[PDB]
Design a binder for this molecule. Structure first.
Ligand SMILES: C[C@H]1CC(C)(C)N(C(=O)CN2C(=O)c3ccccc3C2=O)c2ccccc21
Ligand SMILES: C[C@H]1CC(C)(C)N(C(=O)CN2C(=O)c3ccccc3C2=O)c2ccccc21
Ligand SMILES: C[C@H]1CC(C)(C)N(C(=O)CN2C(=O)c3ccccc3C2=O)c2ccccc21
Ligand SMILES: C[C@H]1CC(C)(C)N(C(=O)CN2C(=O)c3ccccc3C2=O)c2ccccc21
Lengths: 479, 479, 479, 479
């Protein structure tokens, strides 16, 4: 072009040649490199306290299983059930016994709670609740049973005695009515003070676990799976100043620098997008003032650089992350999962920002941009393969999921089928069927035809096209 | 052609251009898309009740193992055997004890049965039966044992007492003759009322399990594998109307709509095949009335589009499915396995029907129809590879199957060999041999040569040709 | 050529065109197809009795472990050891106790033996033998221990009482000297009558197992691995005629037909090789009597057809197999392992004989003979890769084998490294190192560099060349 | 060139043609082949004694776990913890009991030690030490706990009585203060005489293990992982001459020959590098005395052959190895790990020296040197893929490592992610998430998106380029 060709060309040139010609020093360049190191150490420094929370929550859960389940070892979370009446009674009584004699037996430190919520009365702590049918008279031989699903909640409340008994039982009389039994649910919460947090030196981590011991009998199959689930609940409990002076200032000073580096890069990107709008206002130099080529103004949408849009997306996650971290570390906030996903995806997307920095010798972008050539065909190919995929996925879910371990949900089917097309647990899937060889042989004989067809189709007949697309894009890009 | 070129061409054109030119609105197009959603939700809605049946059957089996096997935990179904006389006695007596004291101990609800069948006399319920040799005098040292395989069936009948004993034992005297023992088989059936079926609200699921506890001693190897197998048997047992009004109408109204959608599509396909027969009656315009080209009438067989034939095949499975579902849900039918395979294969084949819908921009069919180009060569290549495959399959079955876990049947060999050529449990196969390194070292040394050769031949020397065929078809199709 | 061109060309033409032109009916063709079915059913019919022998031997071994090892369950063959003196004593005494009270407790039928061999005196049956040092005075604190490796064999003989005690102990006084102890070895043999062999109806299978219970203390590591090994020993023991009339004639009549079919094919191949020698006697028509081309007489070695040589090799295995089978089934022979390898390799090599039959449309041999084109380059490439392979194999054996499970022998290294280059147990190898992260961190840090380098080199940088060779041969063969 | 073209060309010619023309006999050639056999048998002969040390150390550790841990079986090293106060007490007392009654119970031979070090007083042997907080008053309900991390070390000393008690307890009074407990650490060392070393006949291996039984309670999670770690410590203890005459001379005579062969090859390589410097002194024949190509003197760096440089690097490891072996075998040195890595990498690098020998028919180097062509592009491609890799690696470490087994450290993440891109434990990673489906569903839903994206990106979209680079180099090299 005549007038603005210099500015047109200068926008798309590489940073070295752009810096060699005109403008200012590459301050934008360094802050991106600094961002990568700043956010990754932030990510890890968050990670130290992150896993400290999860290990504490989980190990407490593991500890609760070895107190309030009679005969549970570390192994068989599933396949831990009652098969006998007195044995289930013993399971239920063991939980209550160990709840009553908790501070005697336990290694940690678990304070009880008085009943504020709905499963508890004003005073109670442990509260085992029989979900059982309102109407019921089951007897397989003779007629008339008369059942309707109305769950009556027989809750038996009990709270423990403290170490000094004031001078100023019940659950031993418990009967379940096993023919009418939907389940038994032992609810109790335990407050604790997490003393693991003295590596980063934030002692105020006063947890409250919510133990749900569930004797689940939704099957009525003579087998009542016994399980123990915990919900945490975290806030402070009065202890300021003991050995906390530096870390409160340092970690505060670190994340504000992350915020500074991310905001400074976000501003410099905002300036880069600000340039984007002006070019659109040129309208391809009004067709060079010649009305030439008959331009359709669709490529004008694809014109603007996406790497900046990705960079901004990653920034938002970083800066949203750091405010979540300042909150969760030094204030009333409590959700590590969200902050971890945020800072993690932020670092994932930031580290791939180096690819943007890699445009030297005009040879990296031959290897990188083959995906930009392929993606059109890969998208179109992926549809038809996914179409077949969902067929096997929906088929194997309902047909094989009843009889087998790996297909119990569409998630697991979509995991298993995906692990199949690369080849892991490919024999184990067929090995699940060896139990079904002498029971529902049509399901066994179907599953062979299913698994052979599925992986023969995708590992050979379909993957090869996907390799041929990506290698075929590499064949075109190198010319 | 002159006259029917328009109709000739109009048949093979895509639905968009076909609709743009002449004919009617695309009602056929929408009903195929509706079919996909209608049949998949049908499939899943069947799936809810499907796994409810399998979980109930299986968990009851698991419950029976923990009652009627002395020392069985969830783990080691195989490798659960008696090794000692009194221990086997205890195993046999434990089953009978737990049968006698079943409604006391059990968590579920199991009603007994009176002896109608052949292993039971008129009154009996539990019936342990010694299969033992008629003639036998085995004694490895001294001469003359005189054995012939005539199994004498010493059955000891016993039925339990109900909770009210009328005012108006034996099996404790049991002796097996272990040198002559073929096996001991404890048969008993238990009736139950499946109360798990109140999610879909069909309470009438009155099962009758047939427990076969088998002390299998066909080996005479001082180890008698103890196992427990169950056959279900399902029908109703008198309870109409309690909370069943809507679901009886809704699920009935859903599958008839599936039948309507499948039949309407089947009719519209019948109209599409009806057009097929007319072209055949043209006979390639009697060679354009010129006798030109010398047409052989083989391509005339390949002329007609198969996607309709696949669509009809999938319809049949859907409509046969839904009538099986209406039957099994509402009215005395009982085979979930068949209906699941039917509706599942129906949905598998229906979902791949979207590929037929995908013919836009003339680019999907470049990726899809490479298989139609390749299949000629892939079929011809597959024969020679399968020929070699069966060699290793028949060889490894008889040679390695005695000594190892993965080759105990041609099915498992064909699974293992197939998992090998992609690479799963490839080390575990060699790891099975490490026991055989100090016993039958020729079998070990053979198996190395077998497994190396087999996977070196197929993963490298043979797979590469299959990749080259499919990629080679992709090389030809894109021109 | 002039005279013998017809015979020259007629030799190499396909069987269809060869039969169309001149000669006789294709009797050679059918007998090869018949051979495949005849030898495979032979193979399987041998296989029925083959695994019957192995299952009996192994299950008896499993039974011996559950009698003569105190606390052994099915699981942990390795990692079953004594750690305490009295516990080892109990282990040793349990074996002897259970040997003394064998026919009381056992389920099978085990007759004892009187001492003919070298570990037994004239009369003894069980004989526990302490291998311990002649000189020894070990005491880590103080000086002078004076040890030389001369194993003194303190054998304590004991044989059991029969059910009638004649009117006309010791091992309870046993002391091991654990500081001087090399091991304790309990030897005893048990005769049995294998009654599993009444499916094929050959009752005379009178086994004699040789139980070696070894308390191996070659380590002196405060842990003495307890293991039990068995050698079988099989011949008849006087019982002719009870229900044996047909099977003795049928199986005899089957293998002689296999011998007939193999010998007839071997003769017809001998006739095909007989033609081979005549052509050599033509000497390429003495250069057409023109001295043309300057022929070097190396291609004359490759001239003669190899498929016949393979066919003869496979025949020899079949016919050597069948005579081994006639022997082992109906005579004093006893080695299933050799016959299984023989008939198995025979069937493996026979089934690949169909490839020879597949030369139709001149298109199978384009897919098959690409290996004949590639093998020159594949051999040359394989050397350099194997050269690197043995480097990692010898390195990982001595360096990683001490610390890890998968590298304990060059066999296992060569299995593991080979399973690595396709990708199975690739994470488990790295997972073995996680124990060594806090002990010998240089070995851990070496093993990372080893396993990364090894599989990065072979899965990517080396396999790709092997794929490129085989695909590159396919690129050349199709022209 | 005119004058030195002969010497220029003669340097780069193959050994056969170089030997055919001028110079001396190929003594260099044979000694390289001899080196391969000499160093590999050295490597293995070292390996015999190498694993003898590791097996002894490890099996002793295994033995210590079965003495000084109450209820530990071989299985669950992790997931072996105390959950109850008295149970932990019993765990602690069991170690001390078994320490006091060690020579009674044990199978080996463990002499005690008197307290020289810092955890022991002048006389003590066993010394259990409570790491507990100086200040502490934790009580989740009520206010004011006042904790500072100052670990007070309450060590309770106790040494055992010898077999003669002289005519001229405490730890039973032990109390932990479990609310203030950081951990309990039982330290004791055991001297032993390794009698396993009489295969190579070096009896003087007098070990001293340092048992650290750690009741680690850094979590305060009501679960105190119990573990047992051992550090060895090896030197001689007075026993010269019993049956040691030959092996002392033979193994000495073997490694000096290795040193001779390596030094002779190192000298001959020094002569090969000596030739390298002369060519540099020619300065590309002063531009052929024509000033022609304007040569940049970078290719001047590349001229000297790398395989020689690698050969000398591998020599250094061999000769450093052998002196370490002479030392560790026949002198006061003690580090098998370093010598194993040294001789192992030496043999790894020596065996790949055969590739250097393989330059015959000018066809091996077409297959080998494709990596020298590819490495430029492979390096450049590897950067961008590693950039993405570290994104997933740092992301999955902190996000998934808390909740899962395979991501607990960046090492394990880098192992797991690498095993993913070939496809092993690809389903097991997704199977770890099935616990997290009902707890932190955002982490579960993130991990799906993570694992799908990561392996879909690398197994398909990225690996294909790496295959295309290596196959693309093979495409260029064959022309
Ligand atoms: C793995 C990547 C490449 C490609 C085309 C091979 N491909 C499939 O083969 C089928 N397929 C799914 O339908 C799908 C859905 C959710 C997770 C993973 C997958 C999955 O593996 C697919 C389909 C959808 C999205 C991504 C992909
Ligand atoms: C897996 C697909 C592709 C191909 C050619 C690689 N291929 C084999 O390599 C050998 N092969 C069998 O003989 C075979 C038989 C039954 C189930 C699976 C297989 C199996 O993997 C084969 C052979 C027959 C039918 C399908 C296939
Ligand atoms: C597996 C086949 C193909 C090829 C070239 C990839 N290849 C290797 O990569 C290295 N390699 C051995 O050194 C080797 C030795 C013994 C068993 C298996 C192998 C083994 O996998 C090799 C080497 C020798 C013989 C066969 C092969
Ligand atoms: C495995 C080889 C080939 C290649 C390019 C596929 N590649 C990766 O895909 C990513 N990658 C790492 O970042 C990496 C770092 C440390 C060990 C293993 C790996 C690893 O697999 C990589 C990256 C660095 C060094 C070697 C490699």
């Amino acid at each position: 072009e005549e007038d603005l060709r210099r500015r047109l060309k200068y926008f798309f040139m590489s940073p070295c040649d752009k810096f060699r010609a005109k403008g200012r020093k590459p301050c934008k360049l360094m802050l991106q490199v600094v961002k990568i190191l700043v956010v990754t150490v932030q990510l890890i420094l968050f990670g130290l306290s992150n896993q400290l929370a999860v290990t504490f929550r989980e190990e407490n859960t593991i500890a609760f299983r070895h107190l309030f389940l009679l005969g549970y070892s570390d192994g068989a979370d599933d396949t831990f059930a009652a098969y006998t009446r007195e044995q289930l009674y013993q399971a239920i009584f063991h939980a209550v016994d160990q709840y009553l004699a908790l501070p005697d037996v336990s290694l940690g430190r678990y304070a009880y709670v008085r009943g504020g919520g709905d499963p508890w009365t004003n005073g109670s702590g442990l509260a085992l609740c029989q979900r059982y049918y309102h109407r019921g008279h089951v007897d397989p031989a003779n007629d008339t049973f008369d059942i309707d699903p109305m769950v009556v909640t027989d809750c038996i409340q009990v709270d423990p005695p403290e170490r000094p008994p004031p001078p100023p039982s019940s659950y031993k009389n418990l009967t379940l009515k096993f023919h009418k039994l939907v389940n038994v649910t032992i609810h109790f919460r335990l407050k604790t003070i997490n003393l693991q947090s003295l590596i980063n030196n934030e002692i105020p981590d006063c947890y409250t676990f919510s133990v749900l011991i569930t004797f689940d009998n939704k099957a009525h199959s003579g087998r009542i799976p016994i399980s123990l689930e915990t919900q945490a609940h975290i806030q402070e409990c009065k202890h300021p100043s003991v050995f906390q002076h530096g870390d409160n200032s340092f970690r505060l000073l670190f994340d504000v620098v992350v915020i500074l580096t991310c905001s400074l890069s976000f501003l410099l990107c905002a300036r880069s997008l600000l340039r984007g709008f002006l070019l659109q206002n040129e309208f391809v130099g009004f067709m060079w003032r010649q009305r030439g080529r008959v331009i359709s103004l669709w490529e004008r949408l694809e014109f603007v650089n996406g790497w900046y849009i990705l960079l901004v997306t990653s920034d938002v996650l970083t800066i949203s992350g750091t405010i979540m971290k300042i909150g969760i570390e030094a204030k009333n906030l409590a959700s590590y999962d969200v902050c971890s996903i945020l800072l993690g995806t932020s670092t994932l997307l930031v580290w791939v920002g180096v690819i943007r920095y890699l445009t030297f010798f005009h040879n990296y972008n031959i290897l990188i941009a083959t995906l930009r050539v392929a993606l059109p065909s890969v998208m179109r190919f992926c549809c038809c393969v996914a179409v077949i995929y969902l067929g096997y996925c929906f088929c194997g879910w309902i047909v094989l999921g009843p009889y087998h371990v790996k297909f119990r949900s569409l998630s697991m089917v979509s995991e298993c089928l995906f692990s199949l097309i690369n080849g892991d647990d490919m024999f184990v899937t067929f090995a699940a069927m060896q139990a079904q060889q002498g029971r529902s042989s049509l399901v066994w004989l179907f599953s062979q035809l299913y698994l052979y067809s599925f992986i023969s189709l995708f590992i050979y007949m379909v993957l090869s096209l996907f390799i041929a697309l990506i290698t075929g894009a590499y064949d075109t890009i190198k010319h």
